């Protein structure tokens, strides 16, 4: 049974522009990922209401954050026509950015984990092009 939330747990500042996306980790509520207009994404430890990692590298507003279904990757999509995959346990970017779109990338979708083949995951990105 889930009980209705009734009060503020933590108000955590740190973003310098409006927050445009948020998503909890699939493992637990201890980890939260937010993407903002200050060109960054951020991981939050919600147990103590503290920042954990600041993911930098996009040059546009981070319109989307999305956890992989197993929780081992975090994908961010921005208006700089790029998608970046990060390791959430270290805050470091996995490989290079994903290039190929012509306009803003608006949404992300991970392939379901029971459909992963060839020893890799697949990620779909929808864009304005």
């Amino acid at each position: 049974k889930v009980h209705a939330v009734s009060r503020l747990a933590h108000r955590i500042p740190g973003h310098g522009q409006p927050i445009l996306s948020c998503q909890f980790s699939p493992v637990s509520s201890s980890r939260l990922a937010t993407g903002s207009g200050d060109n960054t994404a951020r991981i939050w430890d919600t147990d103590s209401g503290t920042p954990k990692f600041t993911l930098k590298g996009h040059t546009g507003w981070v319109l989307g954050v999305s956890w992989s279904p197993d929780g081992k990757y975090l994908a961010t999509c921005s208006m700089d026509t790029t998608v970046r995959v990060w390791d959430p346990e270290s805050g470091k970017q996995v490989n290079q950015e994903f290039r190929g779109h012509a306009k803003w990338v608006l949404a992300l979708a991970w392939q379901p984990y029971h459909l992963w083949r060839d020893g890799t995951a697949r990620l779909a990105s929808a864009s304005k092009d």
Binding site: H3, S6, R7, R11, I12, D47, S48, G49, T50, P51
Partner: protein, 286 residues
């Protein structure tokens, strides 16, 4: 003239015993316990936070007519069960003690035949309510960066609804009215102590060894503190009632009764007192 005379002693009015001991502010206590916004006849809980030289004492307390009742208690010496062996009075140990007390209160209530009238009269559109308590700091000074607020922060993170503002946390800036949550995280995981260890190890090695002789002896480096305190938080949230056995001598209750009565000095009886009075009279006569 003699100020301390018979009339002075007869007109003297003593304070309360705990006021004479300097342990209780009754002016604050009366407003803490006897006074409320609402008159719904509901019980009230206060989180008592006290500090010693070597311990942190956190209690959940109700007030009754014959004396206070402790709902749950947590101490910073019980953090040895979760792996914290040194710095048991620092701000982070205060945080962990508050978290332990919060988890123990929730586990005792079952929020982690006899039943309540709330369950008797519960309606369909009703939700679980949080456990609510107010902070009691005693005679401690409530300045920015104090450890009473570390305890209250730990308990609020653990799940007790404690009404508070964030302006007395370390990292709060008065000028901008903004809280530096980086500094708050540093203090939660003990990075101020680790930074001091690095600073002493770079500047004054002798002071470093003298202050942190136990850290060096037990091989607790500065960089391990964050993971140590995080693992302690996780273990507290998993098993809030882990049993910790001290290194002190262990006897039974009646064995300690016998041991203390071996050292108690007995009250002299009327016959012995009269005998000593007669001996004093005989010595004065001689």
């Amino acid at each position: 003239k003699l100020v301390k005379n018979s009339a002075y002693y007869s007109r003297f009015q003593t304070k309360f015993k705990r006021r004479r001991q300097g342990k209780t502010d009754y002016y604050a206590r009366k407003r803490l316990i006897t006074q409320a916004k609402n008159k719904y006849n509901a019980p009230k809980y206060r989180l008592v936070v006290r500090f010693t030289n070597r311990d942190i004492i956190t209690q959940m307390v109700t007030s009754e007519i014959n004396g206070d009742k402790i709902f749950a208690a947590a101490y910073s010496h019980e953090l040895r069960a979760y792996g914290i062996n040194h710095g048991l009075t620092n701000w982070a140990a205060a945080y962990a003690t508050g978290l332990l007390l919060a988890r123990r209160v929730l586990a005792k209530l079952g929020l982690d035949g006899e039943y309540t009238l709330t369950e008797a009269a519960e309606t369909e559109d009703g939700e679980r309510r949080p456990f609510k308590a107010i902070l009691d700091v005693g005679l401690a000074r409530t300045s920015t960066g104090a450890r009473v607020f570390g305890v209250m922060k730990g308990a609020s993170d653990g799940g007790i609804f404690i009404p508070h503002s964030e302006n007395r946390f370390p990292g709060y800036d008065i000028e901008t009215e903004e809280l530096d949550t980086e500094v708050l995280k540093k203090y939660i995981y003990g990075g101020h102590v680790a930074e001091y260890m690095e600073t002493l190890a770079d500047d004054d090695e002798e002071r470093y060894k003298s202050q942190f002789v136990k850290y060096i002896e037990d091989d607790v480096e500065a960089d391990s503190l964050e993971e140590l305190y995080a693992e302690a938080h996780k273990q507290i949230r998993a098993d809030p009632f882990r049993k910790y056995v001290s290194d002190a001598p262990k006897k039974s209750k009646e064995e300690w009764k016998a041991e203390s009565l071996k050292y108690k000095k007995a009250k002299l009886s009327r016959e012995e007192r009269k005998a000593r009075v007669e001996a004093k009279i005989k010595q004065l006569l001689a």
